[model samples]
Target: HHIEGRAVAKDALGNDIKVSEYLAKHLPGDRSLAQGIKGDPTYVIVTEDHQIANYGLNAVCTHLGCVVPWNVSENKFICPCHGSQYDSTGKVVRGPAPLSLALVKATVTEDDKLVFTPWTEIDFRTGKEPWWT
Candidate 1:
């Protein structure tokens, strides 16, 4: 799903897909698909035993305001920018952040495609950087 000259990740079908829609296609219990391809790599690990869609959003840190990154080995979303960590549903596991990361909106549409509202202008805007020098 990684590439040049574009933003956002594509699906197995090679269409530019939203992380939300991507999750919808996978049946529970599959490692399914995962990527930080868009802005941050989001994950939706569906549970086999309980049929749970263990969802996650990788967005912003509410503390010093750095975008959080998925710590694959650590199995958590961590903001190394100021040392904050969050769980899948955006629960704060550590601080320097008084609050958890804001989960972006990932509501399923009537057409069933996941259309989401990003928590910050910086995240969803393609090919743009923050105001920090």
Candidate 2:
């Protein structure tokens, strides 16, 4: 359920790897694609079969609208403006953020590149607290 969308990989056969594994193996590039302007940050998780899972969230920090960066050392997203913290799945772990990061739907290209689809279906302005948190 954490996966919002999936796509067939470039290779018909897929690799089952955690998000961390993929980032670690392919360091310095293609780990995450960042968007500018009004677009959000998107993360893709490699999975079994030909399907790769996509995880996207509003990059705008809930506090003062600064883009949050995923901190590999902390394993959480840390906001530059007010230091609002969120987990990898976009759940607020610490605040001034007031709410979790809103989900953004994205698409995976035929070559395994992730692109943010125009905002639709889900409202990107509203965020929710994780029920488990």
Candidate 3:
């Protein structure tokens, strides 16, 4: 499914996540899974029904692990250190990178907190339920 680009979820800082801003900027560090945490706070786009898409869309570039920022004008996430680019859904568009952004599962709490589950390697290229799912 396409990203709904809604801002209904709370981020790591307990602020409402905004779809237009670069998500990694509000997270712990620029790199995905930063600070050696298995699960890092990353992109949190929400659908109209409050379903999160690419809940933990890793910001670290697959090329050299540089954190990528969302290009609002182009509606793509582009790496700052290199030229790798990903679509809104975190799919590779152009890259020295080889794969789409990694993902981890997340769910909204009763209080609207966007809580990410511990990271796990899951296949995103082909649709399948992740083990945690």
Candidate 4:
């Protein structure tokens, strides 16, 4: 499923909230997400069943914060930083990366649009948590 919209934040109940207020409340120390540096304007393309099919944004590499781009021809995400590569599903296929691709939480809203939460519940250092994080 392909969804297009002006990226905005919502309350726990999915009420549209101003981006500034949301950032101030949800993210304080991490200004990257607010500054649109950490892939703030995220886009998600999921499958028919609401499962993630593809997702990305123009951002720095999670490995060393170098720029990364999607290589459609290669069917993978390539990081100019240390040459790390991740598959279409955001799983690290090549290393020099400390962990897999950085992921944000996604959910299907009541209106049937995809909702993404730019935060992680898993500790990348441990790699024990599920993918939903």
> What C-alpha lDDT values do all the predictions have?
0.49, 0.52, 0.55, 0.47
> In candidate 2, what are the lDDT values of residues 9-56, reduced to their tens digit?
221133322333344455441224344113334444333333434445
When summed lDDT is taken over every stretch of 10 residues in candidate 2, the lowest stretch is 8-17
Q: Output the number of the lDDT-best candidate.
A: 3
Q: 2 or 3: which has the higher TM-score?
A: 3
Candidate 3, superposed: residue stretches over 4 Å from native: 1-41, 48-51, 118-133
Whichever of 3 and 4 has more TM-score, that candidate is 3
Once fitted onto the true fold, the runs of candidate 1 whose alpha carbons sit more than 4 angstroms away are 1-58, 117-133
After superposing candidate 2, which stretches have Cα over 4 Å from the reference?
1-31, 36-52, 110-113, 118-133
Q: Pick the candidate with the highest TM-score.
A: 3
Tens-digit per-residue lDDT, 1-133, candidate 4: 1233223334344455443344334332121221121224332433444343323232345567665566758877787767898766556778786566555555545554435544446534346574333
Model 3: per-residue Cα lDDT at residue 93: 83
Clash pairs, candidate 2, are none
Model 1, range 14-119, lDDT digits (tens) per residue?
A: 5556544555566654433333335444443545543324233545576876867767577677887878987655567789877655434343345534333343
Q: What does the lDDT read for residue 107 in candidate 4? A: 51
Error of 3 at 82 (Å): 1.1
Candidate order, TM-score descending: 3, 2, 4, 1
Q: What CA root-mean-square deviation does each model show from the true structure?
A: 9.1, 9.1, 8.7, 11.4
